RNA sequence: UGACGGAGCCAGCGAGUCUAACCUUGGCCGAGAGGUCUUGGUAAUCUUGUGAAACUCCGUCGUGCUGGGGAUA
């Protein structure tokens, strides 16, 4: 249930004081937990990053990071009603559609695009056909993997076509939720890595509190859309940055 | 062909040799590639597959 | 009329390269030309005795 | 701006010549692998 | 220009006895000092200062050089020779 | 100054004049150039014009002041079976 | 249906259906002084505070049709002939108005001198198209027949 | 097809001969729609600067510009 | 039971099939009208079979052209050749022969590449 | 900073120009989005490669030029 | 004969159950062989079919090139 103790704090202190010195890892600024479960979570990895809601620590503000928005076919309505609204007029670094995205950025330009942006956010209608447009660099692992957003707050019924409108308070709202909370992507096996906290924006008690938040949310009985995924007994946590070892926490 | 040599000097040393896959498809080392170091171009009898292993028997 | 002075090197040789005042671009460019001509000559020699 | 002043001289080439829980757990997993 | 064996000289009338006769030509022609003294005259005359003049010089080998009015030509002779060699071999001389 | 002629108006022709004091005034060159109307704006009126004699649409009066601003005043202008029955 | 308003260093063509700026001319280099449409409305002249009468075409601010380098003082009034369509009258703070031909924009086809202080206004006489009534800061509405010399008002 | 007999290019229309001669440099070889567009623009502004027929203007330009004698360097 | 006439126009690799039938007067290229043919500076190349002989010829027929292949200017040239020889063929078949060869004289006096394409090239000099 | 988008740089009030300078000078305090604002290795490996190439010439039977 | 930023629209060749990366950080299972999962970096003329680019149209800007070790925020 509740796990926050001196072994966890000792591990995170040791890793922080290791990353502030260790010259083979002077670039990685991110803390991830490696949830080791017992039973195999059966759900297959589609690349839709589900959102783990934190309660009292927004771990990224939606204005200090580059955001790429990938839209539907014509993109005129989304581009204008995003850029000249003053609610979202300075939120997105770039707004390009799928057609001219795969026209422009091919090959090594995709490595430049990956090194260029820091949050890839796509429309939920055109999100599924990104992995051949965006390449393998975005989907090997998960750190710039694209997030779904709805743009309209309109549901699609059969026998009738969705009217095309976009809502900039809604796009700011769910982008605020996306940069606010953290996210996980499930798989078939037992391992599951979640990014919680940063290297210098966050401190040890807030990282511990949002770690425990993600433990609750993943092991929970409710939130069976998103969070009911640890259906058995969780066995371990580890903590690492992107090129460290795995400092163990909560050995069951 | 990817890696049986480590450099263009080695492939230059072994140009024109006869190689073959494990499926008996004969072939011959044509030219050292430029950009990766130990890679080369070989011309075979017909279209080899990606699942094959080329072979240079030497003594 | 404004009056500028002509930049030139006294005691010129057009076959010799000019004096880049850096020694970490001129020397690496010297050994770039050295490495290229000696690599091309060496592997040309070994592919012709392979023939 | 030169009124019979000419271009200046240039200096000579020889004129320019003459002038711990971390380490405990990583050795623990290393020794675990070597133990197996 | 002439290569000397590691040196590139402008073929003066006085920097040699018989480079011109070892190439074939005669000593009564190898005159760069007179295009030097004409460059001095045209580049100190007041009409150059008012900018109503441009100079083109052209060689016995048919090599055409555009001489801008703003050039501060070297007033002595051997600087001019060493400049003219880099003109004939770099094709351009910067301010 | 400017002047309009034979436009749709009871005044057959009109000379309007702009005079640095807020006032722009219209004079009728038929009854000996008498003044007939005038406007007052918030500064020295530096230039004025009206839309010409064949404007055929929205008829405008503009006066641009020396204060840096401009004032515009306008005057504005079943079925085939059933029908065959 | 459009009117050109001269603020400083930009000329704004407003339209008379919505009263907003439809088109704008920004690429001047000093204070712009005069802006007038030709008699057909096909092109627009603008006099500048550097003596550079730029004529664009109306309803396209990107094509400077030609640029007359007039006198060195600020040209203050520029307008085309009302009867003719190819001569342009530009008067400046040089006490001389000019009738340029917009084919030959290097020398003026007439150079109406004879003033003593700061010509600021042109007009043409609406029936006789040879008659140019200019006006300056010493009273004295001088007016010129263009068939004659032109250095002396009639 | 005006380039397969000797004098057949003498009856290509003169605006087209001006267009074809306009589209030649290293940059814009073949860009005939660009040359047609700029001939269209230059005829518009010839008419707006000189109120006359720009086809008559270009015909006059040909007949004024084409020389009537020339020198050939004798052997 | 309806009169219809199909002709073909071709340039470099463009092809354009024109169906002419007795109708109300509507001319369509690729489903869109004839007044939307791009690149809009060669729209008068498409328009000249119409304006050469007057729209009263077209006021009772309705043509439709399916164009495929080629580039922009090859497509407008195949369109105009298809329009021209389609109108001439309809006038041979369902209207009178006097009007047919009046149309042939008009199109041939303008340019006979409205009716006969240049087909086999080149020359071995 | 509310300054006109079409004024020139000369026609500026002083409070507007110092407002520009303030907005640039404390950008993160003004909640500006932070995305808005942002050698001998060749020599030594090259000497090792020329060493390698000299060794490779001398293991064979070669000469210079 | 530019620089950005959108929009429009046009080909012809090409169809072998075949077509195609590398280096890592770690979790678990397994006797090992290895399997799976997770992760960061480098490279990239994409992957088999739909499609091109030049081109056309539209808004904004506006024409004297470039350097590292030193100095001020």
Q: Which sequence of SSEs, written as H and E, runs from N to C of chain J?
A: HH
Query: Which series of helices and strands of chain D comes N to C?
Result: HH
Helical percentage of chain J = 40-55%
N-C termini distance of chain D: 85 Å
Number of extended strands of chain J: 0
Principal-axes geometry of chain D comes out as rod-shaped
PDB class: ribosome
Keywords: ribosome assembly, 90S pre-ribosome, cryo-EM, Mtr4
Entry title: 3.4 angstrom cryo-EM structure of yeast 90S small subunit preribosome
Chain A: Ribosome biogenesis protein UTP30
What do you see in this structure?
This is part of a larger assembly, with 10 protein chains of 9 kinds. Chain A is of the alpha/beta class and 252 residues long. Helix content of chain A is 28%, strand content 17%. Chain A has helices spanning 6-19, 76-83, 98-104, 108-116, 131-134, 168-180, 204-219, and strands at 32-37, 50-52, 67-71, 94-97, 119-123, 147-149, 182-184, 191-195, 234-240, 247-249. Chain A starts with 5 loop residues before the first helix and ends with a strand. Chain C is 49% helix and 0% strand. Chain H has 75 residues and is an all-alpha fold. Helix content of chain H is 52%, strand content 0%. In chain H, helix 1 (14-22) crosses helix 2. The chains are: A alpha/beta (252), B alpha+beta (59), C mainly alpha (51), D mainly alpha (36), E alpha+beta (95), F mainly beta (85), H mainly alpha (75), I alpha+beta (125), J mainly alpha (65). Chains in contact: A-D, A-J, B-C, C-D, C-E, C-J, D-E, F-G, G-H, G-J, H-I. The interface between G and H is small, with 9 and 5 residues. The structure holds one RNA strand of 73 nucleotides. Chain E: Belongs to the class IV-like SAM-binding methyltransferase superfamily. RNA methyltransferase NEP1 family. Chain E: This is Ribosomal RNA small subunit methyltransferase NEP1. Chain E: It comes from Saccharomyces cerevisiae (strain ATCC 204508 / S288c) (Baker's yeast).
Features:
part of a larger assembly, 10 chains, A: 252 residues, alpha/beta, 2 domains, four-stranded antiparallel beta sheet, four-stranded parallel beta sheet, 7 helices, 28% helix, 17% strand, globular, D: 36 residues, mainly alpha, 2 helices, RNA-binding
Any chance you could write out the topology, listing elements then pairs?
The structure is cut from a larger assembly and holds ten protein chains of nine kinds.
Chain D: H1 13-17, H2 21-35
Chain F: E1 2-5, E2 13-18, E3 23-28, E4 34-40, E5 45-50, E6 59-65, E7 70-75, H1 80-84
Antiparallel strand pairs in F: 1-2, 2-3, 3-4, 5-6, 6-7
Chain H: H1 14-22, H2 32-49, H3 54-65
Helix pairs in contact in H: 1-2
Chain A binds one RNA strand of 73 nucleotides through residues 25, 27-28, 30, 32, 34-38, 40, 45, 74-76, 79, 100, 102-103, 106-111, 132, 135-137, 140-143, 187-193, 235-236, 238, 240-246.
């Amino acid at each position: 249930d509740i796990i926050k103790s001196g072994l966890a704090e000792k591990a995170l202190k040791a890793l922080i004081l290791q990353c502030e010195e260790n010259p083979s890892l002077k670039n990685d600024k991110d803390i991830h937990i490696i949830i080791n479960t017992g039973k195999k979570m059966g759900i297959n990895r589609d690349n839709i990053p589900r959102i783990i809601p934190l309660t009292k620590y927004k771990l990224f503000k939606p204005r200090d990071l580059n955001i790429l928005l990938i839209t539907k076919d014509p993109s005129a309505l989304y581009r204008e009603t995003l850029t000249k609204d003053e609610h979202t007029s300075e939120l997105f670094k770039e707004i390009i559609s799928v057609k001219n995205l795969r026209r422009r950025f091919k090959g090594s330009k995709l490595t430049q695009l990956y090194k260029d942006f820091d949050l890839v956010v796509a429309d939920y209608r055109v999100h599924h056909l990104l992995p051949e447009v965006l390449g393998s660099r975005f989907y090997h692992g998960s750190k710039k993997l694209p997030y779904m957003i709805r743009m309209s707050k309109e549901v699609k019924l059969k026998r009738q076509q969705m009217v095309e409108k976009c809502d900039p308070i809604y796009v700011r709202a769910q982008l605020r939720s996306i940069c606010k909370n953290t996210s996980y992507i499930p798989n078939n096996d037992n391992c599951l890595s979640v990014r919680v906290g940063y290297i210098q924006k966050h401190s040890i008690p807030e990282i511990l509190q949002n770690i425990q938040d993600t433990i609750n949310f993943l092991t929970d009985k409710s939130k069976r859309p998103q969070g009911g995924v640890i259906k058995g007994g969780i066995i371990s946590i580890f903590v690492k940055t992107s090129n460290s070892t795995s400092l163990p926490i909560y050995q069951f | 062909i990817k890696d049986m040599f480590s450099s263009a000097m080695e492939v230059a040393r072994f140009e024109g040799a006869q190689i073959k896959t494990v499926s008996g498809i004969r072939g011959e080392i044509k030219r050292a590639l430029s950009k990766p170091e130990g890679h080369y171009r070989a011309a075979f009898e017909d279209k080899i597959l990606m699942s094959d292993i080329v072979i240079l028997r030497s003594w | 009329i404004p009056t500028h002075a002509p930049k030139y090197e006294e005691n010129f040789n057009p076959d010799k390269k000019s004096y880049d005042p850096d020694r970490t671009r001129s020397e690496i460019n010297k050994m770039k030309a050295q490495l290229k001509k000696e690599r091309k000559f060496t592997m040309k020699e070994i592919r012709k005795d392979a023939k | 701006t030169d009124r019979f002043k000419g271009d200046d001289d240039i200096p000579y080439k020889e004129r320019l010549f003459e002038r711990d829980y971390y380490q405990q757990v990583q050795r623990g997993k290393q020794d675990k692998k070597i133990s197996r | 220009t002439h290569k000397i064996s590691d040196k590139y000289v402008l073929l003066n009338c006085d920097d040699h006895q018989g480079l011109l006769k070892k190439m074939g030509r005669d000593i009564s022609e190898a005159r760069p000092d007179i295009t030097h003294q004409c460059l001095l005259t045209l580049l100190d005359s007041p009409i150059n200062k008012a900018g109503k003049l441009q100079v083109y010089i052209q060689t016995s080998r048919g090599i055409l050089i555009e001489v801008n009015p703003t050039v501060r030509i070297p007033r002595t002779f051997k600087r001019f020779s060493g400049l003219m060699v880099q003109l004939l071999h770099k094709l351009s001389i910067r301010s | 100054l400017d002047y309009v002629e034979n436009f749709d108006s009871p005044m057959q022709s009109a000379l309007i004049a702009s005079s640095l004091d807020g006032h722009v005034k219209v004079f009728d060159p038929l009854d000996n150039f008498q003044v007939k109307f005038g406007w007052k704006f918030s500064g020295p009126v530096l230039s004025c014009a009206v839309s010409p004699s064949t404007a055929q649409g929205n008829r405008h009066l503009v006066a641009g002041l020396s204060s840096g601003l401009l004032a515009i005043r306008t005057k504005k202008k079943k079925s085939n079976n059933f029908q065959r029955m | 249906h459009d009117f050109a308003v001269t603020s400083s260093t930009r000329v704004q063509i407003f339209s008379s259906r919505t009263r907003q700026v439809i088109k704008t001319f920004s690429r001047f280099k000093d204070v712009v002084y005069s802006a007038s449409f030709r008699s057909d409305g096909k092109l627009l002249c603008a006099g500048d505070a550097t003596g550079l009468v730029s004529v664009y075409d109306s309803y396209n601010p990107r094509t400077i049709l030609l640029s007359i380098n007039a006198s060195t003082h600020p040209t203050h009034v520029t307008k085309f002939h009302t009867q003719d369509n190819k001569i342009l009258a530009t008067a400046s703070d040089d006490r001389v108005t000019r009738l340029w031909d917009i084919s030959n924009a290097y020398e003026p086809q007439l150079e109406l001198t004879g003033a003593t202080d700061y010509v600021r206004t042109l007009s043409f006489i609406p029936a006789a198209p040879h008659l140019v009534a200019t006006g300056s800061y010493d009273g004295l509405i001088r007016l010129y027949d263009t068939r004659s010399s032109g250095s002396t008002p009639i | 097809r005006y380039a397969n007999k000797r004098f057949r290019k003498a009856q290509c229309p003169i605006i087209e001969r001006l267009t074809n001669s306009l589209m030649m440099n290293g940059r814009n070889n073949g860009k005939k729609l660009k040359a047609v567009r700029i001939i269209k623009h230059t005829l518009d502004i010839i008419n707006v600067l000189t109120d006359q027929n720009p086809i008559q203007v270009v015909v006059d330009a040909i007949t004024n510009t084409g020389p009537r004698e020339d020198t050939t360097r004798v052997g | 039971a309806v009169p219809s006439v199909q002709t073909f126009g071709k340039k470099k690799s463009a092809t354009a099939v024109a169906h002419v039938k007795a109708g109300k007067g509507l001319i369509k290229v690729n489903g869109s009208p004839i007044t939307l043919v791009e690149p809009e500076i060669l729209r008068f190349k498409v328009y000249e079979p119409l304006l050469l002989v007057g729209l009263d010829k077209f006021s009772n027929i309705d043509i439709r052209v399916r164009v495929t292949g080629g580039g922009h200017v090859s497509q407008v040239y195949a369109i105009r050749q298809a329009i021209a020889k389609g109108l001439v063929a309809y006038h041979q078949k369902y209207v009178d022969e006097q009007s047919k060869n009046e149309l042939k004289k008009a199109f041939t006096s303008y340019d006979r590449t409205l009716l006969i394409a240049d087909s086999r090239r080149p020359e071995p000099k | 900073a509310d300054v006109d988008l079409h004024k020139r740089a000369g026609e500026l009030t002083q409070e507007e120009l110092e407002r520009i300078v303030q907005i640039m000078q404390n950008p993160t305090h003004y909640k500006i989005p932070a995305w808005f604002l942002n050698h001998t290795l060749a020599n030594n490996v090259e000497s090792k490669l020329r060493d390698d190439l000299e060794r490779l010439k001398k293991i064979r039977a070669h000469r210079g030029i």
